[PDB]
Ligand binder design. Structure first.
Ligand SMILES: Nc1ncnc2c1ncn2[C@@H]1O[C@H](COP(=O)(O)OC(=O)[C@@H](N)Cc2ccccc2)[C@@H](O)[C@H]1O
Ligand SMILES: Nc1ncnc2c1ncn2[C@@H]1O[C@H](COP(=O)(O)OC(=O)[C@@H](N)Cc2ccccc2)[C@@H](O)[C@H]1O
Lengths: 266, 266
């Protein structure tokens, strides 16, 4: 006979990091809405991160992002069409620059979602990080309206918190969007409004920078008669509320006792 | 020193069956279009498989499906709302009965896709099976038109064969659809039209059987002012053309030398 209750061979059992899980669900939610996930580079030029997004230098608007500037020769930063690009290098302060990279390399209409690691120079506490993730959304084409942006967030909220969930839209400022807005979702289980991110209708000047970069590259203009909306939300906070993580610093902490607790979420 | 080129511990490497892969891609394609995957039971009653789908007994229409009838007491067949149901048991000849199960258990508008094992009494050759899989599609709601059904297949073809792909729609008959149709997709790589499946606008009588079953169950009618389209395509053939499998009998053959060749498709 054999003790069938004895532990078997200690084969290893793996797991996915909580941000991977939260990113995966966010991506699945938007995939169901027609969005496709594309990524951008963590090291960007000032042109894509700021200038092309209507965020010029020495202006109050740029203070909304504490940049991490870089130095070093020999580094080749590829642009939207593999062409080598130049400009003061930095660590992207948000995923937004992919809005520009994508649009020069493609034609409307389309729906994309860009997840990604972003960086910001600021002190890290229990609810703040200098290194975190964002999920960008961009939908462009004839007749795209803000009603559609609200429709997207409503679907996001429903998928994330259920039918007793709701979204809230309030005016807020971003150089890359003309109506500008900030949105929150009602979390029933916790009976409170959490601010998810910012969004708005793509600014006129963003489309212009996009087509100007296209012209300077031989491509024909593709965004003169289209509108669109974009949004950007910060993954960690959503993940924290969703997995009951109290300290945002745990994410990059590397502690196995922390990571292991998420194997169950397949 | 150590011979680092020596084979390592013989840990096992798994794989997914080719039908699982083909089903997964089909489901991913429709998920991107807003469809949700739901399954039905392999053992059905004549009511769902035929009667509710406007396919009465002793009529030419029913010959389109060679049924596998069943016998045996003690078996409990659950209906759309867990209620025990009766009726001559059989092995579903198609996924279509899920159209009815779903509609009694839900309210429009919605988009579903039901993959599933189906059975038919017929001789198995190199390109025919008595046991195979189908993928059903059902989209219901106000204003749903055939233009939308054509739109869906066009997207299916694009996703499956590229931009040089195209769809063809020809009149064909099915008791559960008033315009009725058969569709084919142009496969560039093979320069030929393959017949993928049948579809059409949900028949008036299907909606009626659905609401009648609802009434007989206490639920209010939910399909009097809506239209919709449905389609059903046979997975094996698509998989064969896509993975270059010459013999459809290989699928249920169980031969590892065959199955193993699909580990690469993750
Ligand atoms: N220090 C931090 N730690 C964790 N999350 C943070 C931190 N700073 C911000 N976030 C998250 O980042 C999200 C948005 O970042 P902001 O810098 O506030 O906005 C942006 O980064 C804009 N690019 C978003 C946007 C995109 C498209 C159109 C309009 C607006 C917030 O909702 C928040 O949850
Ligand atoms: N013996 C077989 N072996 C492998 N595939 C088969 C076999 N018989 C049919 N198929 C596949 O099954 C697909 C459709 O099956 P049919 O029995 O022809 O139709 C049907 O089964 C209908 N229920 C489809 C439908 C759904 C919704 C609306 C309209 C029509 C075909 O396109 C074909 O590729």
């Amino acid at each position: 006979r054999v003790d069938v209750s004895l532990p078997g061979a200690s084969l290893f059992s793996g797991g996915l990091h909580p941000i991977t899980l939260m990113e995966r669900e966010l991506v699945e939610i938007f995939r169901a809405l027609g969005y496709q996930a594309v990524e951008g580079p963590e090291v960007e030029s000032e042109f894509f991160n700021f200038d092309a997004l209507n965020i010029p230098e020495h202006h109050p608007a740029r203070d909304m992002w504490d940049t991490f500037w870089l130095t070093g020769e020999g580094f080749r930063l590829e642009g939207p069409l593999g062409e080598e690009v130049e400009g003061r290098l930095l660590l992207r302060t948000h995923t937004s620059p992919m809005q520009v990279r994508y649009m020069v390399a493609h034609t409307p209409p389309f729906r994309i979602v860009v997840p990604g690691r972003v960086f910001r120079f600021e002190q890290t506490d229990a609810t703040h990080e200098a290194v975190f993730h964002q999920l960008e959304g961009l939908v462009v084409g004839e007749g795209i309206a803000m009603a559609h942006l609200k429709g997207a967030i409503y679907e996001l909220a429903q998928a994330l918190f259920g039918p007793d969930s709701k979204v809230r839209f309030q005016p807020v400022y971003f150089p890359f969007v003309e109506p500008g807005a900030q949105f929150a979702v009602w979390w029933p289980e916790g009976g409170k409004w959490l601010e998810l991110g910012g969004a708005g209708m793509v600014h006129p000047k963003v489309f212009q920078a996009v087509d100007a970069y296209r012209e300077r590259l031989g491509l024909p203009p593709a965004y003169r008669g289209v509108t669109g909306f974009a949004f950007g939300l910060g993954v960690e906070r959503l993940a924290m509320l969703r997995y009951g993580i109290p300290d945002i610093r745990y994410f990059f902490g590397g502690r196995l006792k922390f990571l292991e607790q998420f194997k169950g979420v397949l």
